Design a binder for this molecule. Structure first.
Ligand code: A1B10
Ligand code: ZN
Length: 139
């Protein structure tokens, strides 16, 4: 579990979005596993605007932060689940690191700010849904 709070927006994994998230929907993309809802309170997270391939992510299954090298956002195959059929997930970045079900929503940050959130993993890998291209989150 976990979300990014920037301005009047809340960014969450689309498969974990609540009734309130869907009732206050701004944008969602099943292919990216992202959903953005509106909030009344102001969010103070800062979004990174860069091409960093190194950063630190929060791993709830270890209650720890880990430094990682991660790939550029790309289309990657993702197996079926109670949330999606087998498909390519776009804007996804992989890293070698620990992650297990329950870790989705963990933030990945670089020195510039928030890069993305945990969305996939297993087998000694962790996948992050990138948010750096969503320039509208700032305005
Ligand atoms: C269950 C599998 C997974 O990635 N899912 C389920 C949840 C939805 C994911 C998706 N993006 O479509 C696919 C998984 N394996 O290891 C992990 C580690 C972190 C996080 C999710 C996992
Ligand atoms: Zn950066």
């Amino acid at each position: 579990s976990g979300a990014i709070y920037v301005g009047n927006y809340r960014v969450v994994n689309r498969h974990l979005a609540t009734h309130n998230d869907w009732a206050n929907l701004v944008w969602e993309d099943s292919s990216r596993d992202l959903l953005v809802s509106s909030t009344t309170a102001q969010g103070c997270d800062t979004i990174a605007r860069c091409d960093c391939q190194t950063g630190v992510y929060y791993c709830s299954s270890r209650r720890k932060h880990y430094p990682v090298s991660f790939s550029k956002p790309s289309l990657i195959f993702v197996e079926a689940s109670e949330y999606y059929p087998a498909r390519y997930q776009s804007h996804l970045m992989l890293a070698v690191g620990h992650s297990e079900p329950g870790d989705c929503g963990g933030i990945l940050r670089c020195q510039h700010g928030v890069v993305g959130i945990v969305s996939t993993g297993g087998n000694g890998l962790v996948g992050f849904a990138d948010v750096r291209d969503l320039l509208w989150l700032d305005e």
